[PDB]
């Protein structure tokens, strides 16, 4: 966390507090009936003309949580518990799916997955990286501007704050490892059309948010920043047409008070 | 070099933090981070890949603050690294290969080499050849005087990872008989359907100290970052396949170590 002088941990009757919320997935939400899905995915006519519609693009989810006011003292995020909410829903293999074979059940949700979650004293800081720099990201999303071929591997122009929902497409932004001093981020990409979902749930697993120096994220502005993505895979419709399917993520963050100079 | 005690005090630690880009073959002005669509030799004997079909080791020499018989050297103590731009692999709509009627495109997948090293000098390479009759293309540094023994082991094929866009990945490996002064880590997963699995986190530190609590020592006040991250192949609409690479972030803690001679 750092940036300011991190002094000693204040103890007492009111030195600890808890945030506990859920973050919903923005998977593209085609129509009034498909919250948590994307629009059935289409493929560009040409490599040069890639231009996905906004409702075909999953996005990072973010939540600013206001904490009990202080004043310096700052709130220190100490522990996280998180799990994906509604894992069993992925066993619904009967809702106009693709029969895997004659008299087969539907092909279950599976394939390319990004499970990611961050706890920060400020916005998650993003670096842009593009699969194809000539991809035209659709009106209404915040995307890397002034894309060059260098954007495809690394281009330090593409910095940004995860400060808005339904905004930052997943496929062109990643945590910027050159700057998230005040955030703890964890994510995994598994790529492949047949990748099986593997989702663990438990109320027994705590993750500690303290760094090498025993300091957790420090909540600037008395704000805690929960960010998450949980693209679980794709739903295969009867036709074979595929929609990304997302799930909400639970957070419970223990916080304590840290004395700070300036 | 006899290694003496660790200097502590007001300015005894320092940090390098950079990114290394991937040299995957970079066909044309528009395809940085890809290889050229892969072709297959007419015969086993005539294997001769074009330079733009050959991923290469990436290397970066970082000059450190000046310090200096009884002298000081920078000791690399910890590394943090992750692949930058993992999410970009979810782009399944950019003229890919529909896995089936109305399917999304086949995502980047298949044969992968993720490798990274931290050294007080160049990574030291041993040459090993899949096929010793393979002619490595004009403009790459490759094993010279290939014999059939080159296919299993041939100690002639030594070299320094001292140049970018130079050393093809498929004919060089870290030389395990050397690299005293480097810490290297890599994994090959082979197979056309191997799923990419890329973890990212700013919470994972790796220690670079050996059995004796000494990290790499930066000869000439230079730190050597080497990396390869061939993530898999992009399958075009035609079925033609291009290697796809990604940048690697490094952040290395260094401290000062007293040394004789």
């Amino acid at each position, epitope marked *: 966390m750092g940036g300011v002088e991190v002094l000693e941990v204040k103890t007492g009757v009111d030195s600890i507090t808890e945030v506990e919320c859920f973050l919903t997935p923005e998977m593209g939400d085609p129509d009034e009936h498909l919250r948590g899905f994307s629009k059935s995915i289409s493929i560009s006519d040409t490599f040069e003309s890639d231009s996905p519609n906004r409702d075909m693009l999953p996005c990072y989810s973010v939540a600013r949580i206001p904490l009990p006011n202080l004043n310096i003292l700052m709130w220190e995020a100490v522990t996280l518990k998180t799990e994906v909410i509604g894992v069993t829903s992925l066993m619904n293999v009967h809702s106009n799916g693709q029969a895997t074979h004659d008299n087969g059940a539907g092909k279950p949700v599976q394939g390319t997955s990004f499970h990611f979650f961050s706890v920060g004293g400020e916005a998650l800081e993003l670096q842009g990286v593009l699969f194809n720099y000539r991809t035209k990201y659709p009106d209404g999303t915040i995307f890397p501007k002034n894309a060059t071929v260098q954007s495809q591997v690394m281009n330090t122009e593409h910095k940004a704050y995860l400060d808005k929902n339904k905004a930052y497409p997943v496929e062109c932004w990643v945590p910027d490892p050159t700057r998230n001093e005040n955030t703890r981020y964890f994510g995994t990409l598994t790529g492949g059309e047949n990748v099986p979902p593997v989702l663990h749930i438990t109320n027994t697993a705590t993750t500690v948010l303290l760094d090498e120096f025993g300091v957790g994220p420090l909540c600037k502005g008395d704000n805690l920043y929960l960010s998450a993505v949980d693209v679980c895979g794709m739903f295969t419709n009867r036709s074979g047409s595929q929609q990304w399917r997302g799930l909400s993520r639970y957070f419970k963050v223990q916080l304590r008070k840290r004395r700070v100079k300036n | 070099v006899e290694v003496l005690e660790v200097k502590t005090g007001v300015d005894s630690i320092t940090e390098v933090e950079c990114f290394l880009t991937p040299e995957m073959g970079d066909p044309d002005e*528009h395809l940085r981070g890809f290889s050229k669509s892969i072709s297959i030799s007419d*015969t086993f004997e005539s294997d001769s890949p*074009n330079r733009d079909m050959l991923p290469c080791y990436s290397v970066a020499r970082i000059p450190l603050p000046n310090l200096n018989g009884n002298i000081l050297m920078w000791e690399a103590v910890t590394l943090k690294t992750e692949v930058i731009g993992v999410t970009s692999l979810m782009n399944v709509h950019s*003229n890919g290969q529909a896995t089936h009627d109305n399917g999304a495109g086949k995502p980047v997948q298949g044969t992968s080499f993720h490798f990274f090293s931290v050294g007080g000098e160049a990574l030291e390479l041993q040459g090993v050849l899949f096929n010793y009759r393979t002619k490595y293309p004009d403009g790459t540094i490759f094993p010279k005087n290939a014999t059939v023994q080159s296919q299993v082991m041939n100690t002639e094929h030594k070299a320094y990872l001292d140049k970018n866009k130079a050393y093809p990945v498929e004919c060089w490996v870290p030389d395990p008989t050397r690299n005293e002064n480097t810490r290297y880590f890599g994994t090959l997963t082979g197979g056309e359907n191997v799923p990419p699995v890329l973890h990212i986190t700013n919470t994972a530190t790796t220690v670079l100290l050996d059995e004796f609590g000494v990290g790499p020592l930066c000869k000439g006040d230079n730190l050597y970052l080497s990396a390869v991250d061939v993530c898999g192949m992009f399958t075009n609409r035609s*079925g*033609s396949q291009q290697w796809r690479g990604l940048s690697r972030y490094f952040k290395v803690q260094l401290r000062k170590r007293r040394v004789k001679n």
Partner: antibody
Amino acid sequence: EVQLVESGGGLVKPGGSLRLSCAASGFTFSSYTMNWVRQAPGKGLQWVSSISSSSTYMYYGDSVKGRFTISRDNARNSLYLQMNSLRVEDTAVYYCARYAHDWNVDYWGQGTLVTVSS
Amino acid sequence: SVLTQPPSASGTPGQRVTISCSGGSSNIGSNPVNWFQQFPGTAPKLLIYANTQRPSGVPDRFSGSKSGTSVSLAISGLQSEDEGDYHCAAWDDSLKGWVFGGGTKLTV
């Protein structure tokens, strides 16, 4: 649909000059490398010249090295071929063709006739 | 660094005809072949791309095979509407340009 339309072709005397126009409608012309290919009456096809999306890379067939010049105006959705020092052999239908990655040369225009005679 | 295809080919309606295109490492070895179909007094049109692939609108009858430096086009279930010139094309890395074949007039 994608439509390319060539124009500017006609009758010109040896040593003569001539500017050909390709009008692109149906696609972002500014995103693709574009080609000229010609066909001498009764003979096969022969590539003339390529130009990159941003006019960074122009290439020419040897048969017209030094005489022809390719150019594009991405604002006017138009590809041009400047033909100087025209010869009898240069008589052909001049096709305008798009190159797309993986698809390679895909769409052709209707062609425009260039006859160089006395 | 020239593409060599038969100047003419022919067949009986219903037959499979095969037009070959032979190049070198500099072109077909390292670069894909597109086939273009040309009827008299019209432009060339894309028939096969990337050695072996059909754009939408080309019947299953039309097919390709690649073996190293040589490719072939296969017109199966030959029909009269298939009478025309078949053009073989591929990029050449050394000439930095497109090379074509002679053309193949298919008579039925």
